[PDB]
Design a protein around this ligand. Structure first.
Ligand SMILES: O=C(Cc1cccnc1)N(Cc1cccs1)C1Cc2ccccc2C1
Ligand SMILES: O=C(Cc1cccnc1)N(Cc1cccs1)C1Cc2ccccc2C1
Lengths: 301, 304
């Protein structure tokens, strides 16, 4: 029992983190096999940041302009290419600690672990979700660029996020490991702003099912709802629409607890209306939306 | 920017986790140098656990009754002994992945990272605090015994917790790595309960400083207080007393934000008396007490 925001064990990723330097700029890179992945903005200077022409900046670099340091060892860069907003530096050593891995692009609502790193050395690990507005609410300082997000279902690391920037509201934007941004963001210092964020409904429902599994029923009620009436109310509280896909996905949790999905939807409606009146659910006084249905099944039982 | 409950990177400890099997019981062990540490309760059946005589149970076992698996490799147990509530299995191979480490015993209020493990395989990492009532609010299922807690102070892993049991309220109890329980608990199946808990005041203040550093300032006010008056309020709200030592420890954060500790205590006083009036702090509607002052400085400075 208990229920915690739990990250994946970080060791498989720690063994891949390196430091990448170009000129005066240092950030983190991910070393897999004989390739180091990092944000392409490592090649930008001070005056570059508003309207960088990355193709023009990159053609002026040779391999030996990139310093890559793995612990105490310098790696030799023997090739470079850009893919979307990531730089791929070919190096002369395959990383002997390369795990089984894959690159996956995730959808809003998906969770992952972040290994926050500075100067190629890991600082801490925490759990994040991809928000509906394609940002993440991370914890990142200057130097954290190139830190990665991942899942490890089984022994295989799924890399899903690389950190590039902080937006003015203090939330964070980045790419997949093929260098495509999440959301409408770009790697320029022009004014851009996160859209209004919304609550991840399916995850709140998952977490309510977690609370029932762990022995808490106070928030249930005798009512049900249609999917459409649920969505009409939930949108008034800045909750994302719940789709039939989401209802399907909650099927296992429903079967475990004996509480139909639309019955749980009725519970959520009432919680939005009433608040918690001094009670907590799994130790929180707010509804939590950063546990997925998959996460709940993994952690509970 | 941002502030998150953050665990230490777990790699150095992952390379020490093994599976220990005795009869039909499987749980986790910690392999350092040539010794595997695990809960002594691994030698018990259910009926033994009712009222175990550990000395007597252990003398009936040979080395080969302990099956130890490191990944897919069997280790050979060549000795066994007990220290308090931990079993020490001497094995024939030193762990080549042994980090620099120490065994330390932590104080209530201090935080640490837990690597939750099952069948010798790490499953998840999260941050916990040792509660004033000497429990931790962990997340552990059957099979998690022998999972450990740690801090990393440089390149040195300080191991401070080994998991032994779940209490009826769904909180968790365990030992240091020398096998001494935190709290008034025993390793036997008899009725035991968590004592009434209190809030860790110095940590709440730390987290208020974190909030200010991250731009959340609504709760600041023009008032200050003294230690004695504040402590009268804490007691009423089941907060731990604040000591001068605590004030000293928060000194850095005070100087950086321009908010004296007793000025922040006046903020906290008001929050306890009036609540949050619909507002949040760092996204929470509750006052958080599982970040130490060190935790806040570390995350709001960037140490690796
Ligand atoms: O937001 C950041 C970095 C950051 C800071 C805090 C936490 N997370 C990330 N930058 C701005 C932008 C990055 C991509 C589009 S705009 C950095 C600042 C900088 C300095 C030297 C060369 C490159 C850059 C980019
Ligand atoms: O609390 C636990 C284990 C646990 C379960 C869930 C989460 N965390 C830990 N046990 C009971 C006690 C342990 C120490 C004092 S009582 C197990 C149950 C059992 C059955 C047969 C032989 C040994 C044991 C130990």
């Amino acid at each position: 029992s208990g229920f915690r925001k739990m990250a994946f064990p970080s060791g498989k990723v720690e063994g891949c983190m390196v430091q990448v330097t170009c000129g005066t700029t240092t950030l983190n890179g991910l070393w897999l096999d004989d390739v180091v992945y990092c944000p392409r903005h490592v090649i930008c200077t001070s005056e570059d940041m508003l309207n960088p022409n990355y193709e023009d900046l990159l053609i002026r670099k040779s391999n030996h302009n990139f310093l890559v340091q793995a612990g105490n060892v310098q790696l030799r860069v023997i090739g470079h290419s850009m893919q979307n907003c990531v730089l791929k530096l070919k190096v002369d050593t395959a990383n002997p600690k390369t795990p089984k891995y894959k690159f996956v692009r995730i959808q809003p609502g998906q969770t992952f672990s972040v290994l926050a790193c500075y100067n190629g050395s890991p600082s801490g690990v925490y759990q994040c979700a991809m928000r509906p507005n394609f940002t993440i609410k991370g914890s990142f300082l200057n130097g954290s660029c190139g830190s990665v997000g991942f899942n490890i279902d089984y022994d295989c690391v799924s890399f899903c996020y690389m950190h590039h920037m902080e937006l003015p509201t203090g939330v964070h934007a980045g790419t997949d490991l093929e260098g495509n941004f999440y959301g409408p963001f770009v790697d320029r210092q022009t004014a851009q702003a996160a859209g209004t964020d919304t609550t991840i409904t399916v995850n709140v429902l998952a977490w309510l099912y977690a609370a029932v599994i762990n022995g808490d029923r106070w928030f249930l009620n005798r009512f049900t709802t249609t999917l459409n009436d649920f969505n009409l109310v939930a949108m008034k509280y800045n909750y994302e629409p719940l789709t039939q896909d989401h209802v399907d996905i909650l099927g296992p949790l429903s079967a475990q607890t004996g509480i139909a999905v639309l019955d749980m939807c009725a519970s959520l409606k009432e919680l939005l209306q009433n608040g918690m009146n001094g009670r907590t659910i799994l130790g929180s006084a707010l509804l939590e939306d950063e546990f997925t249905p998959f996460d709940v099944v993994r952690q509970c039982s």
